[PDB]
Structures are given as structure tokens and as C-alpha cells.
Design an enzyme around this catalytic site. Structure first.
Site, PDB file in Angstrom:
ATOM      1  N   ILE A  71      11.960  12.081   2.408  1.00 39.48           N
ATOM      2  CA  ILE A  71      10.410  11.720   2.980  1.00 39.48           C
ATOM      3  C   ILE A  71      10.230  10.750   3.378  1.00 39.48           C
ATOM      4  O   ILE A  71       9.812  10.528   4.779  1.00 39.48           O
ATOM      5  CB  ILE A  71       9.428  12.141   1.612  1.00 39.48           C
ATOM      6  CG1 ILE A  71      10.010  13.575   0.979  1.00 39.48           C
ATOM      7  CG2 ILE A  71       7.982  11.983   2.025  1.00 39.48           C
ATOM      8  CD1 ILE A  71       9.147  14.147  -0.346  1.00 39.48           C
ATOM      9  N   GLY A  72      10.094   9.542   2.554  1.00 41.90           N
ATOM     10  CA  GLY A  72       9.903   8.167   3.168  1.00 41.90           C
ATOM     11  C   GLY A  72      10.356   7.353   2.175  1.00 41.90           C
ATOM     12  O   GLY A  72      11.040   7.532   1.033  1.00 41.90           O
ATOM     13  N   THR A  73      10.024   5.863   2.316  1.00 42.52           N
ATOM     14  CA  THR A  73      10.451   4.940   1.432  1.00 42.52           C
ATOM     15  C   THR A  73       9.179   3.862   0.822  1.00 42.52           C
ATOM     16  O   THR A  73       8.337   3.493   1.771  1.00 42.52           O
ATOM     17  CB  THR A  73      11.206   4.074   2.122  1.00 42.52           C
ATOM     18  OG1 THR A  73      12.484   4.646   2.459  1.00 42.52           O
ATOM     19  CG2 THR A  73      11.678   2.794   1.216  1.00 42.52           C
ATOM     20  N   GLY A  74       8.867   3.685  -0.369  1.00 38.63           N
ATOM     21  CA  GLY A  74       7.731   2.853  -0.854  1.00 38.63           C
ATOM     22  C   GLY A  74       8.277   1.658  -1.658  1.00 38.63           C
ATOM     23  O   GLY A  74       9.085   1.101  -1.308  1.00 38.63           O
ATOM     24  N   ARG A  76      13.239   4.368  -2.077  1.00 39.88           N
ATOM     25  CA  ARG A  76      13.254   5.431  -1.266  1.00 39.88           C
ATOM     26  C   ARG A  76      13.061   7.004  -1.932  1.00 39.88           C
ATOM     27  O   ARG A  76      12.925   6.775  -3.285  1.00 39.88           O
ATOM     28  CB  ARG A  76      14.639   5.854  -0.528  1.00 39.88           C
ATOM     29  CG  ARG A  76      14.744   6.810   0.523  1.00 39.88           C
ATOM     30  CD  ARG A  76      16.168   6.906   1.130  1.00 39.88           C
ATOM     31  NE  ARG A  76      17.240   7.304  -0.037  1.00 39.88           N
ATOM     32  CZ  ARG A  76      18.370   7.307   0.409  1.00 39.88           C
ATOM     33  NH1 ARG A  76      18.827   6.973   1.925  1.00 39.88           N
ATOM     34  NH2 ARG A  76      19.399   7.454  -0.379  1.00 39.88           N
ATOM     35  N   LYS A  85      12.728   9.676  -6.801  1.00 39.55           N
ATOM     36  CA  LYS A  85      12.544   8.130  -6.589  1.00 39.55           C
ATOM     37  C   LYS A  85      13.566   7.197  -6.768  1.00 39.55           C
ATOM     38  O   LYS A  85      13.926   7.205  -8.265  1.00 39.55           O
ATOM     39  CB  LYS A  85      11.148   7.503  -7.323  1.00 39.55           C
ATOM     40  CG  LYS A  85       9.948   8.489  -7.196  1.00 39.55           C
ATOM     41  CD  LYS A  85       9.288   8.582  -6.120  1.00 39.55           C
ATOM     42  CE  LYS A  85       7.698   8.909  -6.151  1.00 39.55           C
ATOM     43  NZ  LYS A  85       7.017   8.849  -5.034  1.00 39.55           N
ATOM     44  N   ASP A 134      -2.213   0.481  -9.743  1.00 39.98           N
ATOM     45  CA  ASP A 134      -2.086   0.592  -8.310  1.00 39.98           C
ATOM     46  C   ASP A 134      -2.788   1.826  -7.802  1.00 39.98           C
ATOM     47  O   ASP A 134      -2.236   2.603  -6.995  1.00 39.98           O
ATOM     48  CB  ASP A 134      -0.422   0.665  -7.960  1.00 39.98           C
ATOM     49  CG  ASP A 134      -0.236   0.361  -6.455  1.00 39.98           C
ATOM     50  OD1 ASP A 134      -0.844  -0.425  -5.754  1.00 39.98           O
ATOM     51  OD2 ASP A 134       0.782   0.852  -5.987  1.00 39.98           O
TER      52      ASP A 134
HETATM   53  N1  LIG Z   1       3.523  11.842   2.585  1.00 34.91           N
HETATM   54  C1  LIG Z   1       4.510  12.773   2.816  1.00 34.91           C
HETATM   55  O1  LIG Z   1       5.192  12.856   3.733  1.00 34.91           O
HETATM   56  C2  LIG Z   1       4.475  14.070   2.015  1.00 34.91           C
HETATM   57  C3  LIG Z   1       4.221  15.298   2.820  1.00 34.91           C
HETATM   58  C4  LIG Z   1       3.903  16.515   2.077  1.00 34.91           C
HETATM   59  C5  LIG Z   1       4.330  16.492   0.696  1.00 34.91           C
HETATM   60  C6  LIG Z   1       4.510  15.284   0.171  1.00 34.91           C
HETATM   61  N2  LIG Z   1       4.936  15.328  -1.248  1.00 34.91           N
HETATM   62  C7  LIG Z   1       5.095  14.229  -2.204  1.00 34.91           C
HETATM   63  N3  LIG Z   1       5.173  12.828  -1.874  1.00 34.91           N
HETATM   64  C8  LIG Z   1       5.567  12.124  -2.527  1.00 34.91           C
HETATM   65  O2  LIG Z   1       5.617  10.628  -2.286  1.00 34.91           O
HETATM   66  C9  LIG Z   1       6.138  10.336  -1.104  1.00 34.91           C
HETATM   67  C10 LIG Z   1       5.165   9.188  -0.598  1.00 34.91           C
HETATM   68  C11 LIG Z   1       5.133   8.410  -1.693  1.00 34.91           C
HETATM   69  C12 LIG Z   1       6.383   7.186  -1.437  1.00 34.91           C
HETATM   70  C13 LIG Z   1       6.291   6.648  -0.170  1.00 34.91           C
HETATM   71  C14 LIG Z   1       6.894   7.620   0.807  1.00 34.91           C
HETATM   72  C15 LIG Z   1       5.695   8.663   0.787  1.00 34.91           C
HETATM   73  C16 LIG Z   1       5.426  12.430  -3.996  1.00 34.91           C
HETATM   74  N4  LIG Z   1       5.816  11.441  -5.452  1.00 34.91           N
HETATM   75  C17 LIG Z   1       5.657  12.500  -6.284  1.00 34.91           C
HETATM   76  N5  LIG Z   1       5.637  13.676  -5.947  1.00 34.91           N
HETATM   77  C18 LIG Z   1       5.300  13.510  -4.506  1.00 34.91           C
HETATM   78  N6  LIG Z   1       5.251  14.632  -3.374  1.00 34.91           N
HETATM   79  C19 LIG Z   1       4.712  13.964   0.655  1.00 34.91           C
END
Ligand SMILES: NC(=O)c1cccc(Nc2nc(OCC3CCCCC3)c3nc[nH]c3n2)c1
Length: 260
Positions: A12-15, A19, A35, A139
Site C-alpha cells: 500500500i504505502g510507507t508511514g 511499510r 505494519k 497523533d
Molecule cells: N491510503 C490508501 O492507499 C488506501 C486505499 C484504500 C484502502 C486503504 N486501507 C487501509 N490503509 C491503511 O493505512 C495505509 C496508509 C497508512 C500508513 C501509510 C501508508 C498509507 C490502514 N491501516 C490500518 N488499516 C488500514 N487500511 C488504504
């Protein structure tokens, strides 16, 4: 208990922690995320700080809090994987971006649902039903607020500029429950106005605006009553901000706001 039990579908992505990847649980095909936290450079006593926190947040359960499912230690990758609910609807920062792009303000009904559900989530943190340690979110911003398929709130993730920086933090005072409330005020304001209450090019100019405590009314689209409760969360004095109980007492908040 192992990485093998899950199939990475994609990244998905990195926070902050690291990741985040969407995954399939082998046992039943359930879609989830995990995570990643690299503990490879941590000491044993640095680790000790982490294990207590992870456990506390793990007991936290509420329909408006991202659900914890599992934890994985991978020696080979020196990584700790925290498995959690996948939130189909994405996050609120994307909702706000979309409003800006479309030039459409969000309905007051949607804002009241988000206020209601975040405040419920925070209440479970601030007052564990029964019955363990008090948790502050610490946060709270649109990117940490996720949505399911019916756009119910899922509060998660317990060089940039800190738009939401509370008067406490800024005055060398300890982050408290009312600091969560200040952040909720900033988030709801931004949901209404499609911009945060205090904006600035520099941090010192931002701190100046935040100390003065002044901001535009939210758009006239929104009722005086909604403007009032958000404005109350943005009180400079923390003891003038409402508790989660006081927010939920508001005449605006009705049964149908608790769940879509
Ligand atoms: N932001 C997205 O790309 C995205 C699009 C559709 C669905 C989701 N779902 C999602 N997404 C999450 O976080 C991804 C986000 C947060 C961390 C950094 C990268 C992006 C979740 N954390 C717990 N449950 C989560 N579900 C996400």
C-alpha cells in the site's frame, strides 16, 4: 504466528512505523493489512518500551478503532509485523483532497457522523469501559482516520509542518486528553473548511497564529451549532475544551450518527 500464514498481495504505502502491505490470511482468505517495524537496531531495553505499548493498544477494542488481529516476529527480517483490519474506504485526508478538487463542501450530516464516531473512539481510549490503562491517541490527523466500505470511522495508527500543534505542546506542557480534543477540533474544522484553522509558511509564523487562537468561521453552509462545538475544541485554554462526554451531549448528535 509466522509470515508464512499470510500472502503479501501488494504494498500500500510507507508511514511512521514503517511499510504497510495488504495481505491475505491463508486460513480463510480474509483481506487485512500489516505494519512492519524493523527492530534490528533496537537494544533490549529500547525493545521493552515497545512491547508494553503494543500490548496496551492490543486490548483496545471498539467498532470505530482499527481492529488488531495478530503480531509476528521475523528473526530473519528482524521485523515485527502487526496485522490489522483493512479499511476499504481509505482515509479522511483523501476525502478532504477530493472535496477541494471537486469544489464541493462535505454535507453537515457526514461531518456529524465523523465527529460522533471519532469521539466515541477517543472515549474508549480516554475511559476504558472496563478496564485498563488510559490511552491518548497522540497523533490525531486526517491521515490516521480510516474509513470502511460504508464510510464509518476507523481510528488507527496510534520535515512537515505540524498544523495541529496544541497550545500545551507549544508551551512545554505535557500532552493530555484535551490535547486529543484540540486535534479533533483541527480535524473537524479542516473537514468543514477544506483547510486547517491555522496556516503558515514557517513554523514560527504558525506558532504565532496558534498562540493568538483566532481563525475564520467554518463555511456558512454549516450551522452555528456545529461551528460552536468545533470552536470550543480549539479553545486556547485546555480546561475550556469539552471532554468526550460533553461533545457527545451536544444536541447535534443523534442516534443515526453512530453508524452508517
Ligand atoms: N491510503 C490508501 O492507499 C488506501 C486505499 C484504500 C484502502 C486503504 N486501507 C487501509 N490503509 C491503511 O493505512 C495505509 C496508509 C497508512 C500508513 C501509510 C501508508 C498509507 C490502514 N491501516 C490500518 N488499516 C488500514 N487500511 C488504504
Amino acid at each position: 504466528s509466522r509470515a508464512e500464514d499470510y500472502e503479501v498481495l501488494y504494498t500500500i504505502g510507507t508511514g511512521s512505523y514503517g511499510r504497510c502491505q495488504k495481505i491475505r490470511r491463508k486460513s480463510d482468505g480474509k483481506i487485512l493489512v500489516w505494519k512492519e517495524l524493523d527492530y534490528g537496531s533496537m537494544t533490549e531495553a529500547e525493545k521493552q518500551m515497545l512491547v508494553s505499548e503494543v500490548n496496551l493498544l492490543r486490548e483496545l477494542k471498539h467498532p470505530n478503532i482499527v481492529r488488531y488481529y495478530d503480531r509476528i516476529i521475523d528473526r530473519t527480517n528482524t521485523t515485527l509485523y502487526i496485522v490489522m483490519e483493512y479499511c476499504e474506504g481509505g482515509d479522511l485526508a483523501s476525502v478532504i483532497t477530493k472535496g477541494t478538487k471537486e469544489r464541493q463542501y462535505l454535507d453537515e450530516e457526514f461531518v456529524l457522523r465523523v465527529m460522533t464516531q471519532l469521539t466515541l473512539a477517543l472515549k474508549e481510549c480516554h475511559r476504558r469501559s472496563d478496564g485498563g490503562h488510559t490511552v491518548l491517541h497522540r497523533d490525531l490527523k486526517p491521515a490516521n482516520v480510516f474509513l470502511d466500505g460504508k464510510q464509518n470511522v476507523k481510528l488507527g495508527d496510534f520535515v512537515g509542518t505540524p498544523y495541529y500543534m496544541s497550545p500545551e505542546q507549544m508551551n512545554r506542557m505535557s500532552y493530555n486528553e484535551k490535547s486529543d480534543i484540540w486535534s479533533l477540533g483541527c480535524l473537524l474544522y479542516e473537514l468543514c473548511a477544506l483547510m486547517p484553522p491555522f496556516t503558515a509558511f514557517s513554523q514560527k509564523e504558525l506558532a504565532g497564529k496558534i498562540r493568538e487562537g483566532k481563525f475564520r468561521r467554518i463555511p456558512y453552509r454549516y450551522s452555528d451549532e456545529l461551528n460552536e462545538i468545533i470552536t470550543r475544541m480549539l479553545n486556547l485554554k485546555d480546561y475550556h475544551r469539552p471532554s468526550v462526554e460533553e461533545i457527545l451531549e451536544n444536541p447535534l448528535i443523534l442516534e443515526h450518527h453512530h453508524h452508517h
